Amino acid sequence: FVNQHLCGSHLVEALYLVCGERGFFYTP
């Protein structure tokens, strides 16, 4: 739970950088 939440924060930042202007979607 806590481990999954901490990873999600970094995943969400990484997606923001890779996708750029196209944007992205995050659903846990």
Partner 1 sequence: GIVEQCCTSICSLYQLENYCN
Ligand X SMILES: O=[N+]([O-])c1cccc(O)c1
Residues that bind ligand X (CB under 6 A): 10-11, 14
Return the one option of ligand X, partner 1, none that residue 9 interacts with (CB less than 5 to 8 A, by type): none
Q: Which does 22 bind (CB under 5 to 8 A by kind): partner 1, ligand X, none?
A: partner 1
Q: How many Cα neighbours within 13 Å face the side chain of 23?
A: 1
- Rounded Cα–Cα distance for residues 15 and 1 (Å): 21
Tell me how far, at minimum, the Cβ of 16 lies from partner 1, in Å: 10
Report in angstroms how near the CB of residue 26 gets to partner 1 at its nearest: 6
Do residues 28 and 8 touch, judged by C-beta distance below 8 A? Answer: yes
